[PDB]
Amino acid sequence: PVLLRSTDTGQWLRINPDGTVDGTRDRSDPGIQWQISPDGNGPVLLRSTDTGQWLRINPDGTVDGTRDRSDPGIQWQISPDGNGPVLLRSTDTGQWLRINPDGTVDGTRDRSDPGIQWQISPDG
Numbered sequence: 001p002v003l004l005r006s007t008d009t010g011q012w013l014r015i016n017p018d019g020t021v022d023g024t025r026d027r028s029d030p031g032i033q034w035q036i037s038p039d040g041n042g043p044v045l046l047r048s049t050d051t052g053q054w055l056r057i058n059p060d061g062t063v064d065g066t067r068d069r070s071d072p073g074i075q076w077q078i079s080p081d082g083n084g085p086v087l088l089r090s091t092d093t094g095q096w097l098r099i100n101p102d103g104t105v106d107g108t109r110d111r112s113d114p115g116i117q118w119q120i121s122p123d124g
Contacts, residue, residue, distance in 0.1 A: 001033045001049050001124050006099045007085045007117035013055075013097075013105065015048045019065040021055065023103040033123055036078075043075035043091045055097075057090045061107040063097065085117035 004013040011023030012032040024032065033049045046055040053065030054074040066074060075091035088097040095107030096116040108116065 001035055001122075003027075003032055003121040003123045004034060004046075005119045005121060006115065007119055008114040009099055009101055009103075011099055011103060013099070013118070015051060015053060015055075015065050019051075019053060021063045021065060021105045023099045023105060036120070039075065043077050045074050046076060046088075057093060057095055057097065057107045059093055061095060063105045063107060081117065085119045087111075087116055088118060 006023060009023060011025055012027060014024045014029055015021050015031040031048065031050050035047045035049055036044050037047060038044045048065065051065065053067055056066040056071055056073040057063050058073050072092040073090060077089045077091055079087040079089065090107065093107065095109055096111065098108045098113055098115045099105045100115055
């Protein structure tokens, strides 16, 4: 399992009891633990160890959790910036996973956005 921490804001990617996704500065939060699992085709899926929901980005740019394994918005492509943070890009929509200073998580097509860099940290 891994944690995903924003380079820009220092917030960890969190899924909430209500299926919504946002950021937190509180590492004691349970919904911040994820598994990165290649689907074998090139992309990876990001699955919450807490709830089993996959991280989904929708065409409207919202990011949430789903249990629908067939949803096309759960496929992500990792692009590492050297040995540093990575970008996570939707295979379906082309949007990057973004976290904003206010803690909201969504998609953007702006590759220059500072909120799209994520440090992957092991958590067991």
